[PDB]
Paper text:
The disease is associated with the presence of a plasma cell clone, and is caused by extracellular deposition of misfolding-prone monoclonal immunoglobulin light chains (LC), transported to target organs through blood. LC subunits (ca. 215 residues) consist of two β-sandwich domains, each hosting a disulfide bridge: the highly variable N-terminal domain (Vl, ca. 105 residues), a short joining region (Jl), and the C-terminal constant domain (Cl). Here we present the cryo-EM structure, at 4.0 Å overall resolution, of ex vivo LC fibrils extracted from the heart of a patient affected by severe AL cardiac amyloidosis. We show that the ex vivo fibrils are composed of an asymmetric protofilament hosting 77 residues from the LC Vl domain, coupled to two low-order regions that comprise about one-third of the Vl domain and portions of the Cl domain.
Cryo-EM 3D reconstruction of AL55 fibrils resulted in a map at overall resolution of 4.0 Å, in which the cross-β structure was clearly resolved. Consistent with the 2D analyses, the AL55 density map showed a fibril core whose consecutive β-strand rungs are related by helical symmetry, with a rise of 4.9 Å, a twist of approximately –1.6°, and two low-order outer regions. For each LC subunit deposited along the fibril axis, the inner structured core is divided into two segments: the central part of the density displays a “snail-shell” trace that is surrounded by a second, “C-shaped”, extended polypeptide stretch. Several bulky side-chains visible in the map, together with the Cys22–Cys91 disulfide bridge, supported chain tracing and modeling for 77 residues of AL55 Vl. As a result, the first N-terminal 37 residues map into the internal snail-shell region, while the outer C-shaped stretch hosts residues 66–105. Individual LC subunits assemble with a parallel β-sheet topology along the fibril elongation axis, i.e. along the inter-subunit H-bonding direction. Each subunit presents nine β-strands; β1–β5 belong to the snail-shell region, and β6–β9 pack around it in the C-shaped stretch. As previously reported for other amyloid fibril structures, the β1–β5 modeled strands do not lay in a planar arrangement within the fibril; rather, the snail-shell region adopts a β-helix-like structure. On the contrary, the C-shaped region (β6–β9) lays essentially in a plane; given that it is covalently bound to the snail-shell region through the Cys22–Cys91 disulfide bond, this segment in subunit i is located at the i+1 level. Two salt bridges stabilize the fibril core: expectedly, Lys82–Glu84 is also present the native folded state, while the Lys16–Asp95 salt bridge links residues that are 40 Å apart in the folded AL55 Vl domain.
Numbering used by the authors:
A (entry chain B), B (entry chain C), C (entry chain D), D (entry chain E), E (entry chain A): 1 to 37, 66 to 105
Write the structure that this text describes.
Amino acid sequence: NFMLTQPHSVSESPGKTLTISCTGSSASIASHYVQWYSIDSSSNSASLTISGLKTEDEADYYCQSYDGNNHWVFGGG
Amino acid sequence: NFMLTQPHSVSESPGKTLTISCTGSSASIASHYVQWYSIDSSSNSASLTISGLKTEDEADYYCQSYDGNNHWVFGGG
Amino acid sequence: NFMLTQPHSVSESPGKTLTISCTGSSASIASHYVQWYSIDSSSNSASLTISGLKTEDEADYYCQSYDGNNHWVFGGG
Amino acid sequence: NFMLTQPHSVSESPGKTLTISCTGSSASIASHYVQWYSIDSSSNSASLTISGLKTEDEADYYCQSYDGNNHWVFGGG
Amino acid sequence: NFMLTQPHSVSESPGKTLTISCTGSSASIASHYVQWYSIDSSSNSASLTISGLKTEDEADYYCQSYDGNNHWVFGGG
């Protein structure tokens, strides 16, 4: 779901840069998650058959960020 | 869902730059999530058959950001 | 859903720049989420058949941002 | 749904610049979400058949932004 | 789900740079998670058959980040 590219970056940052939390779900079939460094690049999926699928899902994500100065702070349930 | 590209960036930022939280869901079939660094680039999916699908989903996402100075603060349920 | 490109950026910002939260949902079939750095670029999907689909979804997203100075603040349910 | 491009930007901003929250939903079939850095660019979808689809969805999005100075503030349900 | 590339980076950052927590789920079948350093690159999946699938999942993710100076702070359940 999340796609991020920075092919030419000059960056100056006094701070905690990449704070990454609570990503998600991937239910995949013959998927191609592809990354690399007459020309032919080829990622190929053929002719499949799927008959019957049933899924039931309950997803609960919790990310809490409490900063500065905190006192008797309650988070969550 | 989320697509972000910065191919030529000169950036100065005194702060916590990329704070990334609570991304989502990917239910995919023969999907191509593609990234790379006579020419032919090729990502190919063929001729499939799917008969019957049933899905039931409950998704609850929670991201809370409490900053500065906080006192007896309650979050969530 | 969210598409953001900055191919040539000169940016100065004293602040927390990219605060990204609560993205969404992707239910896809043979999808092409494509990013790269006689010419032919080619992303191809062929001739498929889908018979019967049934989906029931309940999505609840919660993002709360409480800043400055806060006291006995209640958020959520 | 959300498309944002800034190909040549000179920007000065003392503030938290991109605060992005509560994006949405993508239910797609053979979709092409395309981004890159005799010429031929080609993204192609062929001749498919879909017989019967039924979907029932309930989406509830909640984004709350409480700033400055707050006291006994209640948000949500 | 999470894809991040930085092919040419010059970065200066006095801070804890990559703080990565609470990633997710991958339920995959014949999937290709591909990374490398007349030309032909080829990742290939053939013509399979799947009859009947049933899955029921409950996922609860918890990431909490409490910083600065904290006193009697309660997190979680």
